[PDB]
Amino acid sequence: MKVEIDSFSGAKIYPGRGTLFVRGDSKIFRFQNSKSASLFKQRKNPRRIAWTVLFRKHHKKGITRKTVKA
């Protein structure tokens, strides 16, 4: 079993959950729920949506030896 991730928001996606969408080009788009999906369907930009892993990474939100002996 793989956890997948929401390619829009970035939120973890547990099995048998969320939706999945195959665009014409075979780019596969996995959503954790209707909310992310419905954004995708309005042409909404994740980096422009405050709560997306994309957005907060863009805004840098809250990221906070050996011996050679050869």
Q: Which is nearer to Mg ion, 34 or 45 (CB)?
A: 34
Q: Which stretch binds Mg ion (CB under 5 A): 22-30, 33-41, 42-50, 51-59?
A: 33-41
Minimum distance of RNA from residue 37's CB (angstroms): 6
Q: Which stretch binds RNA (CB under 7 A): 3-11, 22-30, 38-46, 51-59?
A: 38-46
Contacts of 37 by beta carbon, 8 Å cutoff, 6+ apart: 8, 18, 19, 21, 31
- Decide if 6 contacts 51 (C-beta within 8 A): no
